[PDB]
């Protein structure tokens, strides 16, 4: 079936907390915090998605989970560009990082919303 609304929120809290930390690091130009923030966010997002089936039956759940997971992966994909092992544009980079964080938060709400109606 579906997880409870209370459980979804409970997992969402750890997601928003880490995204806030990411936004905080972006405002202070602490780009070295981008990678570990994306790691924290990914792990929190992963735990949230674990509440829902791997292959969900409903369509809104399937689409929201897809966006949630892809954005989380896309987030640490962008954050990985902060460290070139061997020129880095932080302006273009931070724009993409925030948009990913937004998409994660957006998909998180969609999951809470569809769960509330079923409660």
């Amino acid at each position: 079936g579906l997880p409870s609304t209370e459980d979804v929120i409970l997992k969402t809290e750890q997601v928003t907390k880490n995204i806030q930390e990411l936004l905080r690091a972006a405002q202070e130009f602490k780009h070295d915090s981008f990678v570990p923030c994306s790691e924290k966010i990914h792990l929190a997002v992963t735990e949230m998605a674990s509440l829902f089936p791997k292959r969900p039956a409903l369509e809104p759940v399937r689409s929201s989970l897809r966006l949630l997971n892809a954005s989380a992966y896309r987030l640490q994909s962008e954050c990985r560009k902060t460290v070139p092992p061997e020129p880095v544009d932080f302006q273009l980079l931070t724009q993409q990082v925030i948009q990913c964080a937004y998409d994660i938060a957006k998909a998180a709400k969609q999951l809470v919303t569809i769960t509330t109606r079923e409660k």
Binding site: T12, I19, L23, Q95, I98, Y102, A105, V112
Partner: peptide, 21 residues
Amino acid sequence: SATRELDELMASLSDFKFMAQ
């Protein structure tokens, strides 16, 4: 309640995006 706080974050993220634009 909980929906609002997430809306606050989304608003904050979108608000910050304009600052870099």
